[PDB]
């Protein structure tokens, strides 16, 4: 599923991301835009053989099982395919674990390079939340 901006913002808010660990909703929407272009089915292979999955491009090296990332962990205890669902629950729940792990949203390289320090509220402007 490819979400619209406000549609995803609303879904993220319902799933508890608004100000989760101090990150306002615009941060999460901005991250999703640059990570996946709001597409729940997005996958991208990393140089190390791991793969990033879903709206927040969650990495198989640490967070989910895809059966083809040798020596990896599955810290969210989920198959990576669950991260591609039209239902974002699995992605949100796993993102909460990631963002709580010490480095905050710096886990998402696109967030660090493209969202951090920017007017992230613009991503939710005009949305009936
Ligand atoms: Cl915001
Ligand atoms: Cl990740
Ligand atoms: Cl694996
Ligand atoms: Cl933080
Ligand atoms: Na689609
Ligand atoms: Na914070
Ligand atoms: Na993609
Ligand atoms: Na894909
Ligand atoms: Na992989
Ligand atoms: Na997803
Ligand atoms: Na995801
Ligand atoms: Na795994």
Resolution (A): 1.6
Distances (CA, A) of 89 to 49, 83, 95, 125: 26, 8, 10, 23
Cα–Cα distance between 80 and 54 in angstroms, integer? 9
Closest by CA position to 79, among listed 120, 109, 51, 118: 51
Instruction: Sketch the domain layout of the chain as residue ranges.
Output: 1-129
| 8 A C-beta contact, residue 56 and residue 31 | yes
Which one of the ligands is nearest to 74 CA?
12
Respond yes or no: is residue 35 known to be catalytic: yes
Query: What residue spans of 37-129 are helical by DSSP H?
Result: 89-99, 109-114
Q: Which residue in 7, 35, 66, 87 is the catalytic one?
A: 35
Q: Domain 1-129 is in which class?
A: mainly alpha
Which residues are paired to 118 by β-bridges?
Answer: none
The answer to the question of whether 101 is labelled as a binding residue is yes
């Amino acid at each position: 599923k490819v979400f619209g901006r406000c549609e995803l913002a609303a879904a993220m808010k319902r799933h508890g991301l608004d100000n989760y660990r101090g990150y306002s909703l615009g941060n999460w929407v901005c991250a999703a835009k640059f990570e996946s272009n709001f597409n729940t089915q997005a996958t991208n292979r990393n140089t190390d053989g791991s793969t990033d999955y879903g709206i927040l491009q969650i990495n198989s090296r640490w967070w989910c099982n895809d059966g083809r990332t040798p020596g990896s962990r599955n810290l969210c205890n989920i198959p990576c395919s669950a991260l591609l669902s039209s239902d974002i629950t699995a992605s949100v729940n796993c993102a909460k674990k990631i963002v709580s792990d010490g480095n905050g949203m710096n886990a998402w390289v696109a967030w660090r390079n493209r969202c951090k320090g920017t007017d992230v509220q613009a991503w939710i402007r005009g949305c009936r939340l």
